[PDB]
């Protein structure tokens, strides 16, 4: 189903630091709903800047402690059928 693909990069250098996927959310798109990201043309199609007010809404789904002071974070909304 739906997985958030989280990716992050060092602020000074821009070097890649880490990638992590959320667990699958199946066909429940309401996480996107709560970030104000419309389904339209945004599922399977691009990364979005993870802004301050998004951190508390995403932190639950990740092991990585998201530190917007240190790194640039991006999420993308990936969808494949079934367990992937």
């Amino acid at each position: 189903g739906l997985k958030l693909d989280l990716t992050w990069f060092d602020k000074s250098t821009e070097d890649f630091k880490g990638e992590e996927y959320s667990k699958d959310f199946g066909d429940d798109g309401s996480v996107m709903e709560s970030l104000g990201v419309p389904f339209k043309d945004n599922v399977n199609n691009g990364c979005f800047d993870v802004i301050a007010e998004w951190v508390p809404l995403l932190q639950p789904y990740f092991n990585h402690q998201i530190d917007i002071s240190d790194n640039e974070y991006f999420v993308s909304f990936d969808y494949r059928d079934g367990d992937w």
Binding site: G1, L2, D5, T7, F9, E14, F16, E19, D27, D28, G29, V37, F39, K40, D41, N42, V43, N44, N45, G46, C47, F48, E72, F74, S76, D78, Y79, R80, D81
Partner: protein, 96 residues
């Protein structure tokens, strides 16, 4: 209603499963969409001299030369095969 949106475009490979292009690493995405807020998933390889970006309408990686942004053509993430040649009109210089 959702999951039809899922099927709207081609889902991107995971970084680990991009075969026959060298070791790859995500790079900060910079190429914007028109009908979205998404910037295109980007990877670099060959120590950052090659850039691949996901084309989710076509289901293919578009490749480019970091030094000047030149298009190298498109590639198939499962095998690394070149699927289309370089198009001299095209480049990403403005989104490096």
């Amino acid at each position: 209603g959702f999951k039809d949106y899922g099927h709207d475009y081609h889902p991107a490979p995971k970084t680990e499963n991009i075969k026959g292009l060298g070791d790859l690493k995500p790079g900060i995405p910079k190429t914007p969409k028109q009908n979205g807020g998404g910037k295109r998933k980007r990877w670099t390889g060959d120590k950052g001299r090659k850039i691949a970006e996901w084309d989710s309408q076509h289901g293919e990686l578009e490749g480019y030369r970091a030094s000047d942004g030149q298009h190298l053509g498109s590639f198939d993430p499962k095998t690394g095969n070149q699927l289309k040649g370089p198009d001299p009109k095209r480049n990403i210089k403005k989104y490096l």
